[PDB]
Amino acid sequence: AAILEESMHARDQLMEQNFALDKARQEAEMAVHARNDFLAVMNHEMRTPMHAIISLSSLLLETELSPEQRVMIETILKSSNLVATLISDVLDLSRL
Amino acid sequence: AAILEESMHARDQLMEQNFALDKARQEAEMAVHARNDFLAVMNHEMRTPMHAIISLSSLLLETELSPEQRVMIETILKSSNLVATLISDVLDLSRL
């Protein structure tokens, strides 16, 4: 019955190991959920300035510019378009 | 003992649970890692366009501008500097 004792002890160790695995997974899920919530909540704060820059660079192009100023402003518009788009993609990151 | 058989049976069930859990834990950890990698990719893809916007705005201000172009470009420099920092911070705070 030291055999029984040994069995019951292996049961304790397994139950310990199982809660351990359970804890780890739950921590990960929780941590991800909270960080995604934060990411989602912040999205309009990231996207609004990009929209401001898209509007402005776009409208600058309607004014009289040197050829150099124009290629530089084109690049601002094009860059801000891509960044807006990537920000939009990040908003898909919850939950895809 | 039939007692021992019931003890070993309980041990069996713990091992089955241990295996599902270990798998659930691995899958959760890969999910966390893939999400971190994506946020890093996102940060990577926005950084250079972001820098282009800030840099080009600054340079444009060294050139000959109507007062109207000047107020608009100044707004771009202000806005893009602040949002670059905000985006950088939010993506870092969103990780692990």
Round to whole Å and give the CA distance between B31 and A40.
Answer: 18
B35 close to A36: Cβ distance less than 8 angstroms: no
Interchain CB contact of A94 with B (< 8 Å): no
**C-beta neighbour count of B91 within 10 angstroms:** 20
Q: How far is residue B75's CA from residue B79's CA, in Å, rounded to a whole number? A: 6
Structure's resolution in angstroms? 2.2
Q: Give the A:B interface size as CB pairs under 8 Å.
A: 134
From which experimental method does this structure derive? X-ray
Query: With contacts defined as CB-CB under 8 Å, which chain A residues touch B96?
Result: 31
CB B23 within 8 A of CB A24: no
Topology of domain B1-96, CATH: Helix Hairpins (1.10.287)
What is chain A's Cα-based Rg?
Answer: 27
| Residue B55 contacts A where some CB pair is shorter than 8 Å | no
Cβ A79–B7 below 8 Å, yes or no? no
Which residues lie closer than 8 Å to A45 by C-beta, 6 or more apart?
B86, B90
**Residue B17: closest CA among A32, A5, A66, A20:** A20
Phi, psi (degrees; rounded to nearest 5) at A8: -55, -30
Asked if B21 reaches chain A (Cβ–Cβ under 8 Å), the answer is: yes
The DSSP string of B6-56 is: HHHHHHHHHHHHHHHHHHHHHHHHHHHHHHHHHHHHHHHHHHHHHHHHHHH
Which distant-in-sequence residues (6+ apart) come within 8 Å of B91 by Cβ?
A90, B39, B42, B43
What is the four-CA torsion angle of B57, B61, B66, B71, rounded to 10 degrees? 60
**Domain chopping of chain B, boundaries:** 1-96
CB contact, 8 Å: B50 with chain A?
A: yes
Q: Which helix (H) or strand (E) holds A51?
A: helix A43-60
Q: What does the alpha-carbon distance between residue B70 and residue B24 come to, in Å, rounded to a whole number? A: 57
Q: What is the DSSP string of B56-79?
A: HHHHHTTS---HHHHHHHHHHHHH
d(CA A54, CA A79) in angstroms, rounded, equals 9
- The torsion defined by the Cα of A72, A77, A83 and A87, in degrees rounded to 10, comes to 160
CA angle A64, A66, A72 (to 5 degrees): 105
Residue of A nearest to B69 (CA): A60
